[PDB]
Amino acid sequence: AEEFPVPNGFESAYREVDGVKLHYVKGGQGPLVMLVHGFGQTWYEWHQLMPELAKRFTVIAPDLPGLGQSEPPKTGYSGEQVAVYLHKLARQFSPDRPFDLVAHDIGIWNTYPMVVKNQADIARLVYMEAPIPDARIYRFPAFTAQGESLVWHFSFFAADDRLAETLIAGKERFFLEHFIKSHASNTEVFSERLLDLYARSYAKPHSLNASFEYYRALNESVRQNAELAKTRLQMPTMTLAGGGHGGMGTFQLEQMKAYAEDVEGHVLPGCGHWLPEECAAPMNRLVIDFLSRGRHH
Amino acid sequence: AEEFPVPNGFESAYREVDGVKLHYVKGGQGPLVMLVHGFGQTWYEWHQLMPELAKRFTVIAPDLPGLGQSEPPKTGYSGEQVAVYLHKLARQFSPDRPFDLVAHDIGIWNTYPMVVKNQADIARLVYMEAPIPDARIYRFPAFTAQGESLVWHFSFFAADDRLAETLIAGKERFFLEHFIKSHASNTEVFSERLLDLYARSYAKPHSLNASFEYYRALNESVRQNAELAKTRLQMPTMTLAGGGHGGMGTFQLEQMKAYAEDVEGHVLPGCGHWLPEECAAPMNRLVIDFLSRGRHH
Numbered sequence: 001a002e003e004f005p006v007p008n009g010f011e012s013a014y015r016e017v018d019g020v021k022l023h024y025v026k027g028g029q030g031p032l033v034m035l036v037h038g039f040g041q042t043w044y045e046w047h048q049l050m051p052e053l054a055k056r057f058t059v060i061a062p063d064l065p066g067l068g069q070s071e072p073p074k075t076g077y078s079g080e081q082v083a084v085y086l087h088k089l090a091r092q093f094s095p096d097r098p099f100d101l102v103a104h105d106i107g108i109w110n111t112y113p114m115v116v117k118n119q120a121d122i123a124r125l126v127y128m129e130a131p132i133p134d135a136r137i138y139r140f141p142a143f144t145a146q147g148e149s150l151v152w153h154f155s156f157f158a159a160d161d162r163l164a165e166t167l168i169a170g171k172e173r174f175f176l177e178h179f180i181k182s183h184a185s186n187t188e189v190f191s192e193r194l195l196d197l198y199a200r201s202y203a204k205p206h207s208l209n210a211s212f213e214y215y216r217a218l219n220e221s222v223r224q225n226a227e228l229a230k231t232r233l234q235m236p237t238m239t240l241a242g243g244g245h246g247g248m249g250t251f252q253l254e255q256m257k258a259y260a261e262d263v264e265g266h267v268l269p270g271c272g273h274w275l276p277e278e279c280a281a282p283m284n285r286l287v288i289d290f291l292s293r294g295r296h297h
Numbered sequence: 298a299e300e301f302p303v304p305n306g307f308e309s310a311y312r313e314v315d316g317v318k319l320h321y322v323k324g325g326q327g328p329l330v331m332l333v334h335g336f337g338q339t340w341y342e343w344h345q346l347m348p349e350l351a352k353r354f355t356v357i358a359p360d361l362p363g364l365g366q367s368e369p370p371k372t373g374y375s376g377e378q379v380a381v382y383l384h385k386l387a388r389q390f391s392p393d394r395p396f397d398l399v400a401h402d403i404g405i406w407n408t409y410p411m412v413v414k415n416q417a418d419i420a421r422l423v424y425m426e427a428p429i430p431d432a433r434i435y436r437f438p439a440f441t442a443q444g445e446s447l448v449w450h451f452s453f454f455a456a457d458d459r460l461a462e463t464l465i466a467g468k469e470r471f472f473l474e475h476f477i478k479s480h481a482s483n484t485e486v487f488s489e490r491l492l493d494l495y496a497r498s499y500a501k502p503h504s505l506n507a508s509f510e511y512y513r514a515l516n517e518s519v520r521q522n523a524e525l526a527k528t529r530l531q532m533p534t535m536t537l538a539g540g541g542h543g544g545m546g547t548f549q550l551e552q553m554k555a556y557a558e559d560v561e562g563h564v565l566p567g568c569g570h571w572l573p574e575e576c577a578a579p580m581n582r583l584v585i586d587f588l589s590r591g592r593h594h
């Protein structure tokens with residue numbers, strides 16, 4: 001069974017990595033690029049970019065552990081633990097050559113440690129729409145002069161006693177529509193049909209729980225990254241962020257400058273958090289062009 | 298029926314104020330002291346203090362509009378709008394003398410405008426455990442290195458789509474217990490019976506909504522207060538705050554120093570946010586002593 005429609009000419013399959021069955025969608029030929037989704041979504045956020053990249057690359061888009069059709073992690077949900085699964089998965093498909101990495105939202109949290117620990121394995125890097133977990137996250141406001149803060153959910157999801165699962169169970173579809181639209185500028189792209197697809201996936205009880213465990217592990221990830229960040233990234237890096245409602249604006253590039261020696265950043269006007277769907281044309285173009293500076297076919 | 302047991306020597310009663318039926322509990326003899334509760338609670342949080350104060354003062358403890366047994370406001374939930382109801386209620390019982398005001402939590406938000414605009418009506422002021430709404434609240438962090446913030450609910454409650462009512466309905470007791478305990482040092486004072494009573498009251502659909510409408514009006518309250526604060530408070534003021542887990546610590550007095558000419562403050566070690574219940578004896582002592590410096594029975 002498939003939760004989301006696979007693009008024509010791609011395959012949906014699984015690889016067991018360290019005892020965990022990871023779902024991925026793969027297509028194309030050439031050097032490998034791995035696309036890693038974030039919270040509220042699955043590999044499917046990349047389904048418009050995938051066919052375009054597959055003209056020049058082998059493209060793989062996994063479901064994060066516990067989300068989509070991937071089994072929960074057996075170790076834990078901190079960035080360093082999850083990154084092991086992702087690094088090993090990618091290296092199964094590209095054992096002898098570096099691969100490219102594109103990550104959105106908590107995809108960043110779940111890949112940063114494997115990038116810094118295996119720099120030679122990463123040719124080029126694109127990060128969009130989430131802070132790397134570090135002390136900067138403790139400075140985000142709980143409440144703003146415009147109202148509902150964009151990261152209040154960090155505390156909601158991290159709260160003990162399964163506060164978030166308990167309140168959200170049975171109302172997953174309602175909650176996700178609010179969360180997604182509240183973080184968007186171009187809300188019109190989030191049709192009821194599309195929201196139904198994403199909600200059905202994260203409503204699986206293990207997936208709802210997994211979602212929140214990433215936040216319960218956030219402070220551990222921050223502690224992990226305080227050590228890891230002693231070495232700056234050396235590979236070409238690009239950041240993207242939305243400049244509209246819900247977007248991170250200038251924060252993305254500014255933080256990345258502290259992490260990377262070679263970084264270019266873009267803020268996309270009139271686009272919020274959900275770049276691949278809110279602003280498919282300019283986002284896809286930026287990603288394709290950036291990755292095409294390296295060898296492809 | 299009554300939602301909470303009325304102390305001997307007191308009466309549960311109602312008054313119409315600008316077309317809104319307000320509930321209160323009243324007893325005692327002497328000059329008037331009005332005690333105003335906050336979020337998650339009702340007049341009943343004052344039930345231990347009331348008998349002691351009633352030896353020296355006439356004591357009135359209203360339910361905030363929409364909460365407890367009080368009708369919702371017909372104007373709105375902003376601080377300036379709600380304060381009109383509370384000011385006029387107090388003046389119905391103390392038309393010829395100033396009265397004292399003690400407020401906890403959002404009782405502060407709902408009284409500050411009438412205090413600054415009618416200073417001749419306020420003999421002495423006691424504020425505990427909430428910021429006066431101003432730009433300071435925009436600095437509180439969304440997330441902490443120890444986990445959930447004490448104020449992420451500002452955004453949860455202010456959010457549109459009736460997010461809070463929709464998620465909390467059917468789980469009102471569960472949520473309130475979590476909220477109370479996360480802001481408490483001394484959780485033992487919150488018996489199953491006490492939590493049941495508070496949960497049942499705010500679970501009334503108009504009360505659950507009313508609760509959150511206070512937060513949906515918070516930015517408006519901040520804008521209102523930016524103008525009102527041009528005039529400093531001149532009456533003798535005392536602040537109280539908890540020094541333990543869940544408490545506001547030095548913030549209460551330090552903020553008040555910017556608003557009031559004559560202020561003294563105390564921080565109570567070993568006490569959290571819910572001062573009248575967690576630390577009834579020393580809080581009661583401090584309030585009774587401070588108010589008893591003025592004229593009484």
Ligand SMILES: CC(C)c1cc(Oc2c(Br)cc(NC(=O)CC(=O)O)cc2Br)ccc1O
Nearest residue numbers: 129130139140141150151246247248251273
């Ligand atoms: C990942 C996702 C949910 C998301 C998080 C966001 O957090 C931020 C917030 Br709130 C506020 C700021 N600006 C500050 O000045 C805060 C500070 O550092 O003091 C910066 C950021 Br970054 C914003 C958008 C967004 O889509």
Ligand SMILES: CC(C)c1cc(Oc2c(Br)cc(NC(=O)CC(=O)O)cc2Br)ccc1O
Nearest residue numbers: 426427437438447448480543544545548570
């Ligand atoms: C009323 C209630 C819900 C509540 C609100 C609270 O908010 C906060 C407050 Br106040 C002050 C700070 N920070 C400082 O004092 C540091 C400084 O400003 O120097 C941080 C926070 Br977070 C805390 C406890 C509490 O129980």
